[PDB]
Symmetry: C2
Subunit: 157 residues, 2 copies
């Protein structure tokens, strides 16, 4: 059954299906959110918390204000994440199809990726618009005679 | 049922299970090999052919002589590949656990990877021994203010 309740420091939102108005109004700086097994859902978290984690979600739409640490999108499909404020790092792991919408205050965000595909970082521009840039998913590795030297095969549309 | 027969230019070896002596003696420069759905199998291909493709194999052990073009290891788990002679590129895609054993004559081989994990390139050393090097599977991406700049997070044991 669909869950959405704070359990200690953890904001548990799981098993959501075809909902799109989910909102977590209250919030504490040391809290964390764990969005699990949610498909075709849309969630918004108001306030600055410690970290978020999208695990095993499909067609999930997330939008948050601030995160003190990390935002993880693991084992998912077609996830959309948006920062209104600031986020240090957004880590995409074992996820296929992910769009990270940054903001004027998180242009310094670091995008860690692994075993993932179809990732795009949307950059904000004066006028509520975003430019799309694909993050590389393929790499060419070579032997130096001393070590392995890896290059990134840049993606284009 | 287990298959292993030349069908045109294609050397079809599929559905093999718990075999380990498979060998393709004959060989033509324009042929290709397609190892499909083979688990806990060991195959050796003698001679120089155009290309090999390991698709959907588990615990597969392959060893070939020469390849004119590419060796693909796609959608697999725990695959071991070894070149006695020369191979231009070895591409690992959607594969978890792959060990590429190179040779004195293919040290210039290129290792293309994507959506894969646990990959290692074994480099030969005077004495029938190999040194192991893990190929990167995680990447850090940053916004330039002009473009995205991707760095490789180097793997260590």
């Amino acid at each position: 059954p669909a869950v959405l309740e704070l359990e200690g420091k953890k904001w548990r939102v799981e098993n959501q299906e075809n909902v799109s108005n989910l909102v977590i109004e209250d919030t504490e700086l040391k809290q964390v959110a764990y969005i699990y097994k949610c498909v075709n859902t849309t969630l918004q978290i108001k306030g600055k918390i410690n970290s978020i984690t999208v695990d095993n979600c499909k067609k999930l739409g997330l939008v948050f204000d601030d995160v003190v640490g990390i935002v993880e999108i693991i084992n998912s499909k077609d996830v959309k994440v948006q920062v209104m404020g600031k986020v240090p790092t957004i880590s995409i792991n074992k996820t296929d199809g992910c769009h990270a919408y940054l903001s004027k205050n998180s242009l310094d965000c670091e995008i860690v990726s692994a075993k993932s595909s179809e990732m795009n970082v949307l950059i904000p521009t004066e006028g509520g618009d975003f430019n799309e840039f694909p993050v590389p998913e393929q790499f060419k590795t070579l032997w130096n005679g001393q070590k392995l030297v890896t290059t990134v095969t840049e993606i284009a549309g």
